[PDB]
Every structure is written in C-alpha cells, then in structure tokens.
C-alpha cells in the first residue's frame, strides 16, 4: 500500500530533521567548550595583569 510507503516517507523526513538536531548538538558541544576556553583565556589575560598590579 502507498500509505505504508508514506509512513516510511514520514519516518525518513523525521530522521533527516532529527539528524540535523544531532549535528546541531555536535556544533553546540564544540562551540560551548570553545566558548568557555575563549572566555577563560580573556579572563586570565586581564586577571594576570590585575594580579601583577596588586
């Protein structure tokens, strides 16, 4: 039946859009760690000058 093929069409459509979320979670995991690293570097850069000043 074409309806049972259409259930597979709906599954494959949901599957690729779920895969986009899974790639977005890879992107999120990369970006949040790198964000914390860059924030940490920028903090430590001025914090070191502040420690030397005091």
């Amino acid at each position: 039946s074409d309806a049972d093929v259409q259930k597979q069409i709906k599954h494959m459509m949901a599957f690729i859009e779920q895969e986009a979320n899974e790639k977005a979670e890879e992107i999120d995991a990369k970006a949040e760690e790198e964000f914390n690293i860059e924030k940490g570097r920028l903090v430590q850069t001025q914090r070191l000058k502040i420690m030397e000043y005091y």
Partner: protein, 431 residues
Amino acid sequence: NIIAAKAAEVRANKVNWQSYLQGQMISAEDCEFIQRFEMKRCSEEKQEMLQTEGSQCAKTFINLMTHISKEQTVQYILTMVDDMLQENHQRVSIFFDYAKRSKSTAWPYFLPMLNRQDPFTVHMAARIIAKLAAWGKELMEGSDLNYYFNWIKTQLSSQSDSSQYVQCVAGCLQLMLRVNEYRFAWVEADGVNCIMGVLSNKCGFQLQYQMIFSIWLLAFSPQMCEHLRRYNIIPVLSDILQESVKEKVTRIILAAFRNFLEKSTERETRQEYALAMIQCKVLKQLENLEQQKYDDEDISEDIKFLLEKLGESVQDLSSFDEYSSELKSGRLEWSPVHKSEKFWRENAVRLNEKNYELLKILTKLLEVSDDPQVLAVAAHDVGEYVRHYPRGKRVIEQLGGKQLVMNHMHHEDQQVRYNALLAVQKLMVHN
C-alpha cells in the same frame, strides 16, 4: 522511535484533573494551576503564569508526578514537563528555586520516578533529569549522580522496543555529558567499559553513533584524555571505523581520534594513541577514507589531520634510536618501525654502529629467543638490512646469522618460517 511515539499517544491521552482533586490526590491549587497551564498556549501566556506562580508551578508538577500511581496521568505530566523544558530550557530554574525554598537539592523530587515499572515513565524521568541537571547551575553529585549513572548502566547492560528504549538512555547520557564535571565523573564510572562491551557486541548503528558521540565528548578534555587510556578506546573504535560503513559513525570516530591527538596532555600520550591507531591499521583505513568522498568536509579535514599526526608518529617511530632501543629492550613485536620502508631504504647502514652492535643483537635474538614474534621480526630485520645494504651479507655471514635464519625457515610457526625464508633468500640472492 519508541519514546516519541509513546509521547504522541500520551499527548492525545489527556486526563481530567478535577477527578484527582475529588479523589483528594492533589490540592485545589495544584488542580487549578494545571488546568490553567493546559489553557496557556502562547509563549507570553506561559511566561506570565510561570513567572508569577513559579513556587506553585514546581509544587504542582512535583505533587502530580510523585503522589499519583495512575501511569497515563504521570506519563502526561512528565510529557508536559519534558515539552515545557524542550520549549525553553530556562524553565529548569523554577524547579531549582522551589528546591532552594524547600532547603533541598532538586534531585530527590525526580530520582524516585526511575523506580516505576513502566519503561516510558522511567525514561521520561531520565529525559527530564538530563535536561534539569545539564541546564541547571546546581550540580547532580555523589549518590544522586551515582543513581542516575547506575540506572543508565542497568539499561545499557540489557543489550526492538528494548533497543529503542536504550537509544533514549544514550540520548539522556549525551545531554548529561554536556557538563564537564559529569563527563569526568563518568570517566570514573566503569560504564565506559560497559559502552566498549556494547560496541563489541555489535549493537545497532544508531547506538554506535550515540555512544561514540559520548566518547567524543570525553575525548575533548586533556585531563580525561590522560585518564581514559585504560579503557582501550582506539582498538574498539578502530574496529568500528574499519567495519561499519555509515558516514555519521565514521565522522564522530575521526572527530574522537582528532580530539585525542589534539587534546592529550603529553606528546607521549599523543604518541601512545597514534601508535595504537597505526597498530590498529587506522592509517591504511584513513588512506582509503581519503579516496572516499562526503557531504561534510570536516570528515576530510579530520582525515588529513590524523594522517599528518600519524605521519609524524611514523617519523618518530622511524628513528634509528627508537629502533636501537626496541632491539636492546627485546621489544620485537611488529612495532611499525620494522615495516617502515623509508627507515630501511635510507638508514640500513646505521646497524653497523658500535662495531655492528645492532646486528650482534639481531643474531643473538635469533640464537636465544623462544618468542616466534621476536624471531620472525629479527629475521625480517636481517632481510631488510640485506635488501637495502647488500655489503651487509658478508657481515651476517661473519656473525654466522645465515645459519640461524636457515634453521628458523623450519621453525614450528609459519610467521617465523616465512620471515626466516625471506632473510635466508636475500642472504643467498647473489655473491
């Protein structure tokens, strides 16, 4: 898959909260709040209500999940909370504020739900817990963290609706592992060895990717890269990378391998990983993967990165000092140096150093050793020495080593016989 299908059925299977109020299972304030919440449907309507009524919001959902035994009702409440946090994760702060007002962590409200008999109810608890504990500033810790991990490990060890439930478990772990502290605590959990076991049992490709994404998160942190060596990751993931076809699995393994060689605390730990990769034929696989082509060039960049870092490891391994050290240590165990054509082609004359000391070792190992690997490798090395330094034939004859390989061509192990045959054949190839 199963939890999304069961959630869609549960979203249709709504219930009359006034019946639980009449049955004294809930307060009038809980019933009136949940009935208003079913009618608040714009984001602004939900925001006004939740921002105005946050203590009663947490109290309502906590009471209606905790005290009610009727599965379809608790399933619905868990579905509404999972949807509420999926619509905006900042709502975790309402449950945490109510826990702080109650002089408690949030975990004791949700952890009891993992003890229910229904798979959807316990996995929806795990989903909400993963969101709550990962998006929260409050840390899941000690016994509460161990209960969640032990529930995960229990479901993992069971390995189909059962497999689709475990896919939700893997997703619940992936969300939790967004937090660095929870990842390091998971390295301290032997559940990493359970994951290696499930991969070795050749679970579905969906679980392979979801698990290896969790491994890739661990592989990002230098501290964990040093600690996790014990779990034999590269062998397992290299088997999956060689055997499995899927681009998703391929990408996330190459990303894990890149993270290991980028992030490791030591050049020695990078060399340990790169050596294990080369031994696990990863370089040969990477070369095939370079000829394969993809819809995501990050795969190709990770291949090039790994091929370069493994190329440096081959250059390090191709040192005559490392070769000398391995001979002096007797470690003739198919270290990739032995098969380095570049090494032999460009360096075989060096074995004449210190009055032929390395050849004296090779022949002495062919005299003394029982180990067929040491024997086969020492014969291979004699063969390559002759192959790239033909004047060496007379030196091996002066050491008597021709007779040792001529004995070992009849050794009980074909690996010895073969390499000993090659070596004696090169010794005998011309005057």
